[PDB]
Amino acid sequence: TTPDRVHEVLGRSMLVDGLDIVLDLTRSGGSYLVDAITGRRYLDMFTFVASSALGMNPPALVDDREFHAELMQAALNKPSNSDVYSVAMARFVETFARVLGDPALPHLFFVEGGALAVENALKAAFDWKSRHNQAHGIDPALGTQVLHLRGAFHGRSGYTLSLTNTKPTITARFPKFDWPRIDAPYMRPGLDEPAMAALEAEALRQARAAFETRPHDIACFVAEPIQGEGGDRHFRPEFFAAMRELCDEFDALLIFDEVQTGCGLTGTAWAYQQLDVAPDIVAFGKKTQVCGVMAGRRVDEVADNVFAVPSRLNSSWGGNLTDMVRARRILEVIEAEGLFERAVQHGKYLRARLDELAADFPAVVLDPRGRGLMCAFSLPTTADRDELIRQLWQRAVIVLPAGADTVRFRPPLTVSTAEIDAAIAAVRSALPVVT
């Protein structure tokens, strides 16, 4: 099978709606994807839907002969880490705890897939609430509902389909639980402090109303600290702090879905660290390669919780050992090279350029925004947005759409300022064409 036959071969078995290239696995490197058909290089602001921290074939992994041996060792087989432990696994878990750990959240659980990471956070919360109810004389059949936001994306699995509400295509015709959903009071341009406070107070009102009309039945509140797929919607720290207080008042856990924001993209290990809100459970994935949850805070108040009792949470594999070994090495690079700090500084650079774009194209480049390297801007209509992405593609720059009118940037943590300049130059070239 040859690069030029890839789309034909796949097309016999599956819907083939992806990018028009064939990935060269060997010649791709850093912030560049190589099309194996033409040899053309593509500037990567997409990073496998934000799942690549270092970009392709990072030198620290490719040149490391000892790591090669460890990776091969892991890659040849696929143990069930659920019941069979290894040195390779233990090294990963200890470096995860060191680099990404929170002392308040000591319980770690790993699984393949971001939606299932979120599901395990939910299951922890369902169990916690039922048992907390039981211990205080409340019916243990209560504690089965999930408070969540409009415009949320938490995945495409049985429980997360009841939470995700972006494109109808994702959720239509699939059975859902009737769980309480509230307005998302995200920052928008031309809203001052009092205006934002009023917006938040209304979501808070709706949240409080949900807790009071469904007594002892809401197990948790789940949120993205910054909504990704819904359109890079950012929230003030004040909103989540108010939600944190309200969750505690009604004995509900706070879960942050950091599958997209996590592992250094915003400039810290986790976006929540910048919002000064302490969650009870964090779900992670994408850049971490292996997915899962970190849990603690109020979780430990229920002694027979899901992390203390055998066989409550499980999967056959307990995550992919190859992913663990690769992630261990990635985390070591992040720590050794100070990549979180690099994300803060280069994020400030990218944001500044998007502000300049807004100044030069004020009716077209709307609402430039970001935290660290997680940046975006919007266009007047979805047609403009879709056209801009096509024009960037022709110029060999890969970016992703979000929501109705957003273009999002997801560069690797190792992106250089020259590479950011190249992406901005491509946007400047394309804009007169779309107008």
Ligand X SMILES: *Cc1c(COP(=O)(O)O)cnc(C)c1O
What are the residues binding ligand X (CB under 6 A)?
Answer: 113-115, 118, 153-155, 224, 228, 257, 259-260, 285, 315-316
115 is in an annotated binding site: yes
**Which residue is listed with tokens 């505690």?**
248
Evaluate whether 121 touches 358 at the Cβ level (below 8 Å): no
Q: How far apart are CA 142 and CA 126, in angstroms?
A: 9
3-class SS of residue 222: strand
Q: Of 154 and 351, which CB lies nearer to ligand X in the complex structure?
A: 154
114 is in an annotated binding site: yes
Q: How far apart are CA 246 and CA 255, in angstroms?
A: 13
Closest separation between CB of residue 212 and a copy of itself, Å? 21
Residues 158-217 that bind a copy of itself (CB under 8 A): 158-162, 167, 169-170, 173-175, 177
Angle at the Cα of 298 (from 178 to 288), degrees rounded to 5? Answer: 75
> What single-letter DSSP state applies at residue 195?
H
298 is in an annotated binding site: no
Q: How far apart are CA 268 and CA 274, in angstroms?
A: 7
Q: Counting contacts by CB under 8 A, is residue 233 touching a copy of itself? A: no
- Distance spanning both ends of the chain, measured CA to CA: 42
Residues 125-144 that bind a copy of itself (CB under 8 A): 126-127, 130-131, 140, 143-144
Q: Which two tokens stand for residue 357?
A: 């774009």
Q: Which residues pair with 128 in a beta bridge?
A: none
Q: How far apart are CA 352 and CA 361, in angstroms?
A: 14
3-class SS of residue 401: strand
Phi, psi of 399 (to 5 degrees): -130, 165
Closest separation between CB of residue 363 and a copy of itself, Å? 31
Q: Of 68 and 390, which CB lies nearer to a copy of itself in the complex structure?
A: 68
Q: Of 185 and 318, which CB lies nearer to a copy of itself in the complex structure?
A: 318
**Which residue is listed with tokens 């109808």?**
168
- Which listed option, ligand X, a copy of itself, none, makes contact with residue 228 (CB within 5 to 8 Å by class)? ligand X
Q: How far apart are CA 410 and CA 50, in angstroms?
A: 6
Among 41, 156, 236, 428, binds a copy of itself (CB under 8 A): 156
Q: Of 172 and 363, which CB lies nearer to a copy of itself in the complex structure?
A: 172
Q: Of 114 and 185, which CB lies nearer to a copy of itself in the complex structure?
A: 114
Q: Of 17 and 193, which CB lies nearer to a copy of itself in the complex structure?
A: 17
Q: Of 115 and 354, which CB lies nearer to ligand X in the complex structure?
A: 115
Closest separation between CB of residue 418 and a copy of itself, Å? 23
Among 40, 63, 84, 139, binds a copy of itself (CB under 8 A): 84
Closest separation between CB of residue 368 and ligand X, Å? 21
Q: 260: closest CA among 287, 282, 235?
A: 287
Closest separation between CB of residue 19 and a copy of itself, Å? 5
3-class SS of residue 234: strand
Closest separation between CB of residue 316 and a copy of itself, Å? 5
Q: Counting contacts by CB under 8 A, is residue 359 touching a copy of itself? A: no
Evaluate whether 255 touches 280 at the Cβ level (below 8 Å): yes
Q: Counting contacts by CB under 8 A, is residue 83 touching a copy of itself? A: yes
308 is in an annotated binding site: no
Residues forming the annotated binding site for L-lysine? Answer: 156
